[PDB]
Design an enzyme around this catalytic site. Sequence first.
Site, PDB file in Angstrom:
ATOM      1  N   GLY A  84     -11.741  -8.324  -1.174  1.00  0.00           N
ATOM      2  CA  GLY A  84     -13.073  -8.314  -0.421  1.00  0.00           C
ATOM      3  C   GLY A  84     -14.030  -9.416  -0.914  1.00  0.00           C
ATOM      4  O   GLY A  84     -15.372  -9.119  -0.374  1.00  0.00           O
ATOM      5  N   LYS A 102       0.884  -1.374  -0.093  1.00  0.00           N
ATOM      6  CA  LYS A 102      -0.004   0.047  -0.309  1.00  0.00           C
ATOM      7  C   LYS A 102       1.062   1.127   0.084  1.00  0.00           C
ATOM      8  O   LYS A 102       0.588   2.102   0.681  1.00  0.00           O
ATOM      9  CB  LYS A 102      -1.033   0.236   1.227  1.00  0.00           C
ATOM     10  CG  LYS A 102      -1.944  -1.260   1.405  1.00  0.00           C
ATOM     11  CD  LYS A 102      -2.885  -1.225   0.623  1.00  0.00           C
ATOM     12  CE  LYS A 102      -4.070  -2.102   0.801  1.00  0.00           C
ATOM     13  NZ  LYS A 102      -3.580  -3.544   0.985  1.00  0.00           N
ATOM     14  N   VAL A 103       1.988   1.307  -1.072  1.00  0.00           N
ATOM     15  CA  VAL A 103       2.980   2.199  -0.940  1.00  0.00           C
ATOM     16  C   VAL A 103       2.155   3.714  -0.800  1.00  0.00           C
ATOM     17  O   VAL A 103       1.385   4.107  -1.644  1.00  0.00           O
ATOM     18  CB  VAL A 103       3.967   2.077  -2.019  1.00  0.00           C
ATOM     19  CG1 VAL A 103       5.187   3.138  -1.794  1.00  0.00           C
ATOM     20  CG2 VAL A 103       4.619   0.632  -1.807  1.00  0.00           C
TER      21      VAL A 103
HETATM   22  O1  LIG Z   1      -9.587  -2.427  -1.061  1.00  0.00           O
HETATM   23  C1  LIG Z   1      -8.589  -3.225  -0.051  1.00  0.00           C
HETATM   24  C2  LIG Z   1      -7.394  -3.488  -0.985  1.00  0.00           C
HETATM   25  C3  LIG Z   1      -6.685  -4.420  -0.266  1.00  0.00           C
HETATM   26  O2  LIG Z   1      -5.413  -4.746  -0.451  1.00  0.00           O
HETATM   27  N1  LIG Z   1      -7.343  -5.475   0.710  1.00  0.00           N
HETATM   28  C4  LIG Z   1      -6.301  -6.719   1.116  1.00  0.00           C
HETATM   29  O3  LIG Z   1      -6.793  -7.803   0.728  1.00  0.00           O
HETATM   30  C5  LIG Z   1      -7.021  -8.729   1.399  1.00  0.00           C
HETATM   31  C6  LIG Z   1      -8.601  -9.124   1.904  1.00  0.00           C
HETATM   32  O4  LIG Z   1      -8.365 -10.195   2.868  1.00  0.00           O
HETATM   33  P1  LIG Z   1      -9.888 -10.894   3.313  1.00  0.00           P
HETATM   34  O5  LIG Z   1     -10.263 -11.797   2.030  1.00  0.00           O
HETATM   35  O6  LIG Z   1      -9.278 -11.699   4.661  1.00  0.00           O
HETATM   36  O7  LIG Z   1     -10.834  -9.836   3.435  1.00  0.00           O
HETATM   37  C7  LIG Z   1      -6.190  -8.113   2.771  1.00  0.00           C
HETATM   38  O8  LIG Z   1      -4.891  -8.628   2.659  1.00  0.00           O
HETATM   39  C8  LIG Z   1      -6.256  -6.624   2.627  1.00  0.00           C
HETATM   40  O9  LIG Z   1      -5.372  -5.950   3.222  1.00  0.00           O
HETATM   41  C9  LIG Z   1      -8.391  -5.414   0.984  1.00  0.00           C
HETATM   42  O10 LIG Z   1      -9.046  -6.077   1.727  1.00  0.00           O
HETATM   43  N2  LIG Z   1      -9.062  -4.179   0.292  1.00  0.00           N
END
Ligand SMILES: O=c1cc(O)n([C@@H]2O[C@H](COP(=O)(O)O)[C@@H](O)[C@H]2O)c(=O)[nH]1
Lengths: 220, 220
Positions: free
Chosen positions: B175, B66-67
């Site tokens: 998501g 997330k730079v």
């Molecule tokens: O908009 C965004 C951008 C992301 O990188 N992420 C990343 O994607 C992953 C979502 O994981 P999860 O399927 O457990 O919700 C996490 O690593 C989160 O940091 C997100 O959820 N939403």
Amino acid sequence: DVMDVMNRLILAMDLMNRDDALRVTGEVREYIDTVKIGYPLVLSEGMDIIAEFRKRFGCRIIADFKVADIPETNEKICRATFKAGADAIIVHGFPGADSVRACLNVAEEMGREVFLLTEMSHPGAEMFIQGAADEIARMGVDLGVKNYVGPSSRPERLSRLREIIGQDSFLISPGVGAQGGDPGETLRFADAIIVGRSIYLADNPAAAAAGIIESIKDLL
Amino acid sequence: DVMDVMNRLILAMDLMNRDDALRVTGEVREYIDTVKIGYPLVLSEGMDIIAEFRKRFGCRIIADFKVADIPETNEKICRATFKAGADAIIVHGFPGADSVRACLNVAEEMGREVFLLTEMSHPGAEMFIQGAADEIARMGVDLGVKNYVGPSSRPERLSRLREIIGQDSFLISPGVGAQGGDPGETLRFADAIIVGRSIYLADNPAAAAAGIIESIKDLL
Ligand SMILES: O=c1cc(O)n([C@@H]2O[C@H](COP(=O)(O)O)[C@@H](O)[C@H]2O)c(=O)[nH]1
Ligand SMILES: O=c1cc(O)n([C@@H]2O[C@H](COP(=O)(O)O)[C@@H](O)[C@H]2O)c(=O)[nH]1
């Protein structure tokens, strides 16, 4: 009442080699008791560098990680960062209130502090961040945030941000020196200035720090 | 013509313990050849984890960092990340074009890729990011960015972002599952879905991955 960091000056230690980072930090420690460590150093030398600095120099450490993820991921980043011994972590406000609250919750659990980054100091900040920055600051106030970051390169913006957060909030400000910001003018509004390259790339970092402090002596 | 990641499914490996992360990743490797590693794992186990995963699993690695800094700091973060062996890095667009360009320059120097994060998937993204997201995407197009991240939780937004970036751009989308997004609907617009908790917290991560793939078999 909140105690100033020593000389109202925070070192941005963005050297990427442990030996260089230790050398420069040690050289300026008589002038600076608060060090900002970010990803350039941490991703090069490991999270252990935080505890090492804290022990060797007995300084405060702000982990400048610009935390900018969803709440669940933010919580994990904050936990790892405080476990590593950081006194505070810098969090972006632009991803919204839930993301900030996640960081505040971990800080509360672990007895640490969150700094909210509002407007940034670089030219690109004008594109999207600047237009949202007043509202980001107001969001911080609404969430009970007490510590903020705002830009030395735009003192009129820094003044406005100070107005929003109040005199009781603590405000630190990067963009001094290399990016064009002035130490004295910035300290009209910020409690402390953050300085990286103007110190750590200097032939004599101690002399550079001493010179900055001399230029703001009447504000201390 | 660009090749899909295996099964159009990317694992978000956000476990914070190396042994657990290795176990789960190994268990799902028959289904997934592309792994997203972020700060939860890296700040807990070190940057060496990237090369370890690459070697052990022969998978692609996207460093989800997330730079979100000024250009000079972004350059340093990107260099450290590619040195560690990451194939690609995720960069926020909200800090503006100069910050993104700094990452693109390092990627060009080191033969790697940048993914531009446009709109985020969590509720707080509605506050500031969503209103800027179309313009962030257009900025990406103007900068020559070919790889993008957009939200599974808002397929109407994902569709709009696809419209802006065109059919020739590569779009990945988090998501899915825990945050409410649907695999099949998301793949109407995204080239690949990112899945974390629905897989890595499952009693049987391999079965969870297999199930997701079964539900989208006609899209493969
Ligand atoms: O908009 C965004 C951008 C992301 O990188 N992420 C990343 O994607 C992953 C979502 O994981 P999860 O399927 O457990 O919700 C996490 O690593 C989160 O940091 C997100 O959820 N939403
Ligand atoms: O708006 C901001 C926020 C920052 O944290 N920073 C950080 O403050 C430091 C500025 O360092 P320098 O004095 O070398 O320009 C860097 O570590 C940068 O990542 C910034 O420059 N602008």
